[PDB]
């Protein structure tokens, strides 16, 4: 009796992710091929920013990933998999529980196989500080990829085997000593909404990924949260407004900069409610419009939208479905496991059934 699941395999370099330091049962995240990244940043960015910042920040990352062993920067096979414990410790200078956050960074800069590991984290988090400024948002680039069940090791590449759909506790590990796993997450991201709203009632709950941005002039942050909630996917937008509304207050006033508003206020009131009242106002028919001898007698109206804080520049959050816990009461634990010689604040989610979903901006 095994429930239906779906395994994946992909030949993935171990540049940003490590299925050796992170044991069986952590999250993963697929990426786009990074040749798309700063061409979109040249195109989609709001007026008056440094579009080449993404091409230079992502440039300095790859260039620091080798520095030695004579290794080319472009490649046919390319690492597009960022492990979850790598991503939390990247943005680890933007949480509240900082003493547990450096306890995530303590095994990140140590347990990884590599030379001068932490030189990436001062760069890769700056790459995320360039994703927001160059305005190609990482939830337009990141994408869920399943949780680990096994790994086959070679120098700088490995065979990542994950679960893209199904229950986590169903797929075989590889060692018949411990033939399953559990979803293992650091406690600097797992923030409930049960006690924080007062919902102490038992029931089945959903798991979401949630990003946070902060758009300012070179003061830009990033967070990743894995939130357990008994809420609908349609009914998250008010609850995320309650938490992160302070970041929404900052983004709507300090996110719009270097745009030039029209000076002074030029656009008057819109008089169509008054122009339709008089039957003595001049009009036009369907053939007389698009004619120069008729359009000059109509009302001239020149709308000037410049410097408006658009919806795309007032984003504070973006979420996606990740999975549910169908149990009667969701059974979470809070332990500290030993990743070598570093002990970590660890949240052990148990009985997770995977359903990915689309993203959704909370603009």
């Amino acid at each position: 009796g095994s429930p239906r699941h779906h395994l994946t395999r992909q030949v993935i370099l171990t540049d940003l992710c490590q299925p050796n330091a992170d044991r069986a049962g952590t999250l993963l995240l697929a990426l786009r091929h990074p040749a798309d990244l700063p061409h979109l940043a040249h195109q989609r960015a709001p007026p008056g920013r440094q579009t080449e910042r993404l091409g230079e920040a992502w440039g300095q990352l790859m260039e620091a990933t080798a520095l030695g062993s004579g290794r080319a920067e472009s490649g046919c096979t390319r690492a597009g998999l960022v492990s979850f414990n790598f991503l939390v410790a990247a943005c680890a200078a933007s949480y509240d529980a900082r003493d547990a956050a450096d306890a995530v960074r303590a095994h990140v800069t140590a347990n990884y196989r590599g030379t001068r590991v932490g030189a990436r984290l001062d760069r890769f988090s700056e790459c995320l500080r360039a994703m927001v400024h160059t305005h190609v948002f990482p939830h337009e680039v990141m994408r869920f990829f399943g949780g680990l069940v096994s790994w086959v090791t070679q120098d700088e590449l490995a065979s990542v085997t994950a679960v893209c759909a199904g229950p986590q506790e169903a797929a075989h590990t590889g060692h018949p000593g411990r033939p399953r796993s559990a979803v293992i997450l650091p406690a600097c991201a797992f923030v409930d909404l049960d006690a924080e709203l007062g919902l102490g009632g038992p029931g089945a709950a959903f798991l979401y990924l949630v990003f946070t941005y902060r758009q300012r002039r070179d003061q830009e942050l990033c967070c990743v949260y894995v939130i357990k909630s008994q809420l609908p996917p349609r009914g998250l937008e008010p609850a995320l407004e309650r938490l992160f509304g302070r970041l929404r207050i900052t983004n709507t006033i300090h996110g719009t900069e270097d745009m030039t508003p029209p000076a002074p206020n030029r656009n008057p009131d819109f008089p169509l409610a008054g122009l339709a009242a008089n039957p003595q106002t001049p009009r036009c028919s369907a053939g007389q419009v698009t004619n120069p001898q008729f359009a000059d007698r109509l009302y001239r109206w020149q709308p000037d939208l410049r410097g408006r804080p658009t919806a795309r520049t007032c984003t504070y959050a973006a979420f996606a479905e990740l999975g549910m816990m169908p149990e009667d009461s969701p059974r979470c634990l809070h332990r500290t496991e030993r990743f070598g010689a570093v002990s970590v604040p660890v949240v052990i989610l148990e009985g997770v059934v995977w359903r990915p979903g689309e993203w959704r901006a909370c603009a």
Partner: protein
Amino acid sequence: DVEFDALLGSYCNTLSLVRFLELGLSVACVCTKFPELAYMNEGRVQFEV
């Protein structure tokens, strides 16, 4: 008009059943089998001089 087509014989292979002891390379091994290996972490072998 009378015609016909024809299958004038059809041929297959014999896959050679290669065994490891039949090779000459079988000296370079010490082959003693496990009924379990993946139940085992790092094992060791001692040597005295």
